[PDB]
Amino acid sequence: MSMVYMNIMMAFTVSLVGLLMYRSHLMSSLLCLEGMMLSLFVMAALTILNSHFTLASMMPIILLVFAACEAALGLSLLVMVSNTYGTDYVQNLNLLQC
Amino acid sequence: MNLMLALLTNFTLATLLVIIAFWLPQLNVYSEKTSPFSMKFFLVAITFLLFDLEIALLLPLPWASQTANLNTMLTMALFLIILLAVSLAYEWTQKGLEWTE
Amino acid sequence: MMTGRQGRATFQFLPDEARSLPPPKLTDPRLAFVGFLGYCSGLIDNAIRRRPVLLAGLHRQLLYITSFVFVGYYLLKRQDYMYAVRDHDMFSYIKSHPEDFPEKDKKTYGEVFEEFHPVR
Amino acid sequence: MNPIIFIIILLTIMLGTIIVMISSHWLLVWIGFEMNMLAIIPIMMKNHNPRATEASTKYFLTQSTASMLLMMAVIINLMFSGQWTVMKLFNPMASMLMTMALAMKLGMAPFHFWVPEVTQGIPLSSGLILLTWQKLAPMSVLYQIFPSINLNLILTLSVLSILIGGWGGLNQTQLRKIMAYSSIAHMGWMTAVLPYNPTMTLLNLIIYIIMTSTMFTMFMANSTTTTLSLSHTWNKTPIMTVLILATLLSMGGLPPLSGFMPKWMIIQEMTKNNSIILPTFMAITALLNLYFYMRLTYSTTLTMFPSTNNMKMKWQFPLMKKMTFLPTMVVLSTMMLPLTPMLSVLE
Amino acid sequence: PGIVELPSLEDLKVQEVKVSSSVLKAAAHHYGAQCDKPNKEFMLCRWEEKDPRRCLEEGKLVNQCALEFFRQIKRHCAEPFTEYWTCIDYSGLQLFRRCRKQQAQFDECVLDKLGWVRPDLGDLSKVTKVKTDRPLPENPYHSRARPEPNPEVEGDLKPARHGSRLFFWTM
Amino acid sequence: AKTVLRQYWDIPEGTECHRKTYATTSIGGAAGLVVSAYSVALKTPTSFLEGVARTGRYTFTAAAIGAIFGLTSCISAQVREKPDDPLNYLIGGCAGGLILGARTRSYGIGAAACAYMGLTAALVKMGQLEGWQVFAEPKV
Amino acid sequence: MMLYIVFILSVIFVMGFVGFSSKPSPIYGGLGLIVSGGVGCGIVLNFGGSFLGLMVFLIYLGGMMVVFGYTTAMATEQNKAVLGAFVTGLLMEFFMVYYVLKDKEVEVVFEFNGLGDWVIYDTGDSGFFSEEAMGIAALYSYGTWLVIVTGWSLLIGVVVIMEITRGN
Amino acid sequence: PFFDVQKRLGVDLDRWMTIQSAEQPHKIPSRCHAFEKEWIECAHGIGSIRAEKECKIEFEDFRECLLRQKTMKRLHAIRRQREKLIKEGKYTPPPHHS
Ligand SMILES: CCCCCCCCCCCCCCCCCC(=O)OC[C@H](COP(=O)(O)OCCN)OC(=O)CCCCCCCCCCCCCCCCC
Numbered sequence A: 001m002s003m004v005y006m007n008i009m010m011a012f013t014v015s016l017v018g019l020l021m022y023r024s025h026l027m028s029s030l031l032c033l034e035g036m037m038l039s040l041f042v043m044a045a046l047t048i049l050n051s052h053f054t055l056a057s058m059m060p061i062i063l064l065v066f067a068a069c070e071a072a073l074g075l076s077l078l079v080m081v082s083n084t085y086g087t088d089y090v091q092n093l094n095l096l097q098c
Numbered sequence B: 001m002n003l004m005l006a007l008l009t010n011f012t013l014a015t016l017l018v019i020i021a022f023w024l025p026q027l028n029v030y031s032e033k034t035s036p037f038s039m040k041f042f043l044v045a046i047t048f049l050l051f052d053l054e055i056a057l058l059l060p061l062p063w064a065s066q067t068a069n070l071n072t073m074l075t076m077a078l079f080l081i082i083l084l085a086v087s088l089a090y091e092w093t094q095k096g097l098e099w100t101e
Numbered sequence C: 001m002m003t004g005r006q007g008r009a010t011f012q013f014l015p016d017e018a019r020s021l022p023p024p025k026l027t028d029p030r031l032a033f034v035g036f037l038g039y040c041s042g043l044i045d046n047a048i049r050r051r052p053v054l055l056a057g058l059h060r061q062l063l064y065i066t067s068f069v070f071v072g073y074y075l076l077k078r079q080d081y082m083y084a085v086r087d088h089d090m091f092s093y094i095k096s097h098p099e100d101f102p103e104k105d106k107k108t109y110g111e112v113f114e115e116f117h118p119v120r
Numbered sequence D: 001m002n003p004i005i006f007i008i009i010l011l012t013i014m015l016g017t018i019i020v021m022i023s024s025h026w027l028l029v030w031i032g033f034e035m036n037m038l039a040i041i042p043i044m045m046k047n048h049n050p051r052a053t054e055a056s057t058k059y060f061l062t063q064s065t066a067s068m069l070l071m072m073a074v075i076i077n078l079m080f081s082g083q084w085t086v087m088k089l090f091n092p093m094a095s096m097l098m099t100m101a102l103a104m105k106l107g108m109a110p111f112h113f114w115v116p117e118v119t120q121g122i123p124l125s126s127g128l129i130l131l132t133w134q135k136l137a138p139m140s141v142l143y144q145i146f147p148s149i150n151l152n153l154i155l156t157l158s159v160l161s162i163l164i165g166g167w168g169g170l171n172q173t174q175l176r177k178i179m180a181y182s183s184i185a186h187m188g189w190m191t192a193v194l195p196y197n198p199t200m201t202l203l204n205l206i207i208y209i210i211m212t213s214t215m216f217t218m219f220m221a222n223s224t225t226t227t228l229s230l231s232h233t234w235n236k237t238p239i240m241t242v243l244i245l246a247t248l249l250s251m252g253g254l255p256p257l258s259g260f261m262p263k264w265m266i267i268q269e270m271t272k273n274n275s276i277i278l279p280t281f282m283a284i285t286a287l288l289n290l291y292f293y294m295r296l297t298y299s300t301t302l303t304m305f306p307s308t309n310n311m312k313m314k315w316q317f318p319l320m321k322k323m324t325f326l327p328t329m330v331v332l333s334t335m336m337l338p339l340t341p342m343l344s345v346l347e
Numbered sequence E: 001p002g003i004v005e006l007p008s009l010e011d012l013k014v015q016e017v018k019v020s021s022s023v024l025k026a027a028a029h030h031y032g033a034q035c036d037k038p039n040k041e042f043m044l045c046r047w048e049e050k051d052p053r054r055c056l057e058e059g060k061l062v063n064q065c066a067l068e069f070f071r072q073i074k075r076h077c078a079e080p081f082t083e084y085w086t087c088i089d090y091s092g093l094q095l096f097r098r099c100r101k102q103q104a105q106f107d108e109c110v111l112d113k114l115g116w117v118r119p120d121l122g123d124l125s126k127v128t129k130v131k132t133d134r135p136l137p138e139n140p141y142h143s144r145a146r147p148e149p150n151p152e153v154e155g156d157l158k159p160a161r162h163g164s165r166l167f168f169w170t171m
Numbered sequence F: 001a002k003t004v005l006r007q008y009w010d011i012p013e014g015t016e017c018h019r020k021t022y023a024t025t026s027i028g029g030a031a032g033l034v035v036s037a038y039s040v041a042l043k044t045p046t047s048f049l050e051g052v053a054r055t056g057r058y059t060f061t062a063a064a065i066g067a068i069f070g071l072t073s074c075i076s077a078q079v080r081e082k083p084d085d086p087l088n089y090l091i092g093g094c095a096g097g098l099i100l101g102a103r104t105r106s107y108g109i110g111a112a113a114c115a116y117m118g119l120t121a122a123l124v125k126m127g128q129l130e131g132w133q134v135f136a137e138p139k140v
Numbered sequence G: 001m002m003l004y005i006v007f008i009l010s011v012i013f014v015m016g017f018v019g020f021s022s023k024p025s026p027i028y029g030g031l032g033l034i035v036s037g038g039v040g041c042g043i044v045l046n047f048g049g050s051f052l053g054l055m056v057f058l059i060y061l062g063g064m065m066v067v068f069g070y071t072t073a074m075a076t077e078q079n080k081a082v083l084g085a086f087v088t089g090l091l092m093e094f095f096m097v098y099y100v101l102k103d104k105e106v107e108v109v110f111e112f113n114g115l116g117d118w119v120i121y122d123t124g125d126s127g128f129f130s131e132e133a134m135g136i137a138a139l140y141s142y143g144t145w146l147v148i149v150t151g152w153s154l155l156i157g158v159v160v161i162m163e164i165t166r167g168n
Numbered sequence H: 001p002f003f004d005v006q007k008r009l010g011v012d013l014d015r016w017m018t019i020q021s022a023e024q025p026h027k028i029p030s031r032c033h034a035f036e037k038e039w040i041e042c043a044h045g046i047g048s049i050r051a052e053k054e055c056k057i058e059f060e061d062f063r064e065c066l067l068r069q070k071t072m073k074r075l076h077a078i079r080r081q082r083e084k085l086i087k088e089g090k091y092t093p094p095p096h097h098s
């Protein structure tokens, strides 16, 4: 591939592992989710710019617009979780076991 | 390289003033002194984000006016702005832009 | 498997070439069964709403039967077309590759040796 | 919720799924999924209670993660082939993430732990959308990229789904959880025959949607969500118990009902490819599904459970629920075996 | 695979045109109306051959016309031209509209001394035709023969032989 | 899993029993870690020390079963001079099944495990002889 | 050492990811994601993407990340695991950097090279425009379908969030 | 597509950005326009089962223009050989390479 791709590709892996291992806060994981889209944004832009894929120069912007809209929907749920149990801890969200 | 030096100088200068500001008066020796989530604020931030994203789709308009398909380009340009105004109307009528409990 | 067929018009319920095939008869056994299904749906409609099963809503029962037969007629028309296409492709492919489908050499039972296993 | 906003949100759920099915570009496929997840959360939060809030959160995190993996597969596929077309992927690593992203969205084992819990925390009408409509979009993509899916991966996810759906359902009394595990079990059948004959993946999907929609509709009519509450139906609407018996028997694959057709055709398309061990193991493990279906038939229609005194006040009012297409769905769920050769319309 | 063939260091040598971008930009309009024929032959060569090694001889002809073009200015209009590109060279953007007064003198000088007419707005951007004896390439992409298509299915669509033939169904 | 299985099937049956046992012990040991990997994840141990005790317990029980299958099934093929014989695997499967009962402290599990593990092992040997396929490659 | 600016930035890019991936307090986690975003734009700028790089600052850092920090300060109530994860992350980064700088070839899932990012850049360009800008401006002439679906999704985002946050 | 609505209606919803050799604004080409064109014209109409065998030569060239894997191996070899001879007194870079 190339030398830069290794770190971008390894940055996605770090964020994925970070998202799959919650500690206590729900806000912490949403950041790991928005880190993933940042790595995908940079990785796609590197590919498109280097190959002179002109019409694909708009794709990274579309990736950013939808990923931010999804992030907004994520924060709204976090707020409604905090207004119920007083904190954004994931251990509280355990009613559905039974 | 020029833009890199300009950023380095500005932030390096700011750091110096900050540290010498926390130390220059400490060259002096003064005797030791001793001894609710709001929903409406959150909705302003989220409304700004969705509006801010729609602005991202409008920034390339000046370049988009150089095309040979002005009829198509002018149709979609007025569609995005009209849709952005429709979002404002929905929040306005649904009491989104209010600060009274 | 029959998706990228050479003779194809995508996203068409009944291509033009299907009109050269005989239509399903209005007395088709499959079409009578589809109509019978519509009638059964009518009776259940009365039962779940606590109406007289056999008599209530004869006008409603008539549209249950007609809609099933109407939809059933076209599905059967497409069913017989897709099977006609399969045979059409199967036979054309056999002509194009005669070496892969040779004419079997036929030997009478007087000469072919089959082992005998007695039951004793 | 305002009725007009309810229609608008529903049409956006449909539009998201339709965009996935009419798109020849991976970006529009991804956009289709995003528009679909954005619109379905409000119908899960509509009842405004902690359980709904928890269910919507567990669904968002699962579907958000799945969409990120899918977009990673698309970019890897762009680097190694320089195109966006919705077809076979050109890198084995892209195929794995793509196959795993779709598995998470579908709810296949071992990416299954959210289906029982999300379906339990939302109303019946929201569960009906979740278990039937939300499965169309991922299956459409699998129909198109199956030539490059890793065989051992897709067949391994299929086998686990059949097992975990079976064992999970035995230990359930809540109706919403029983359908959730039933949904996991039937997914394994759809993806087991996918490498061999994708046409039978659609047939099993169509039949599953019809049968599942019939069950949820009958539960919604009597507002029943527990096994016991369903056992009072014989004393309120006797006809509805006979329809539940027939559908439950159909879902179990017992001939001569409709639910035997897909299990019948999938076993045919696998023995043609000299697959004998897998269809037998799949068919035998499906008897677990027939068991906890039969248990509901014993407490609903084949025995008369105890009733309560206040039930007598219900006899004086009719059913005002919509029960849309219930007469038509129930007949299609039971009396379609003689029309099996009609599956060619799906080719 | 193969070995990339490259021309020799003596096959590329030619007398360069060593004048700054301001000098070229001052003479651009007259230059394009005088050396059009050798110029367009070279460009037709490049867009057709798609290989710079195939159009080296046309390239040298482009250089020679430019050298001869500037010598004529060197003989008749030197001071007017030297004063024209000095004003162009002063601006960071090398604007024409800042030097209309000096342009007229240079434009008039060439008109009298050489009969050169400055092309009008929109002339140098026109598609033109060039008569060349170089044969048209047959396989410019060096592509191989395409794989032959599948046999096409043709004939009459007759009904299925005994129907679906699905297990026991008779139609 | 692809490379280790090749090692087991490359060795002809009833020979080099030391290497076959090592191959079987590896597979069972791996299957033990996979099981204990999910057990720790879904059922949190009370402490780190308790976690490693569980992971070691499952890993040894799984590795003990596989160790005795390859050893027992390879010795049997030697004394009987019958490589292509499923009965060799039946003895190995049941021998491994008893070990499972031994670790669980139950005679019922040992008897049930011996019967079913032994039956499954015999089928595996039959498939290798006759080329049965669990994940068949699409052909038609 | 200025020829390897892109690789140096990428190394800082990863270190920031190990920062907030270890999940310190949300206040510091968001701080680390701002650093990675700024470094991320730096990489995109050096590949020729100026509009895309600046769009990261305006929309990602000055947009979403401000809402993240704004929501953290209002709904977050201002260990060994954090340090353990953070140290584990840096070590893997160091070894990946160490090997790709020793033999200039590393194989982890993919075959990566270590010559330098500059070796793949295009060698010819004489246009009177920015190729990146032309593509993005094509959103209005070519991307009619994209504009409609994107705009509708943003409009539905407004409707959906108000529904979720009403609470009654 | 699962449903070919675009082909039925003759409307180009998203086929304009699928490939990098399609029509680009101002006729700006991609770096691998020639290679993509050759592979597309080789594999057209014969299905992907055949194209994986009868158009492998073109595909390998296309993938070589995308990731440039083979070229970087060759340059890497030359750099090592020059470096090895450099630290032995056995090589002398010419004036125009320094
Ligand atoms: C060969 C010598 C060993 C055998 C000796 C036998 C004597 C008895 C001792 C038993 C030992 C059993 C171990 C056998 C495993 C090794 C043999 C094998 O089959 O290989 C499997 C795997 C090999 O690992 P790999 O580096 O990929 O080798 C590539 C070779 N092609 O090796 C494995 O790791 C398999 C074990 C499962 C690994 C996955 C477990 C989950 C990992 C995630 C951990 C949890 C998530 C991490 C974060 C949690 C927080 C810390």
Ligand SMILES: CCCCCCCCCCCCCCCCCC(=O)OC[C@H](COP(=O)(O)OCCN)OC(=O)CCCCCCCCCCCCCCCCC
Residues within 6 Å of the ligand: F008, F023, F024, F027, F028, F031, F032, F035, F054, F057, F058, F059, F061, F062, F065, F066, F067, F069, F093, F096, F100, F104, F117, F120, F121, F124
């Ligand atoms: C062909 C080439 C050869 C290939 C290698 C052959 C060797 C195969 C090795 C077999 C691996 C078996 C995997 C199971 C490992 C044991 C799992 C385990 O650790 O738990 C066992 C479980 C313990 O439960 P318990 O201790 O009571 O609860 C503790 C709570 N703290 O106690 C139990 O409940 C036991 C239940 C286990 C049942 C699982 C199914 C048995 C394994 C199926 C395979 C059968 C075939 C094996 C024979 C060889 C086949 C070729």
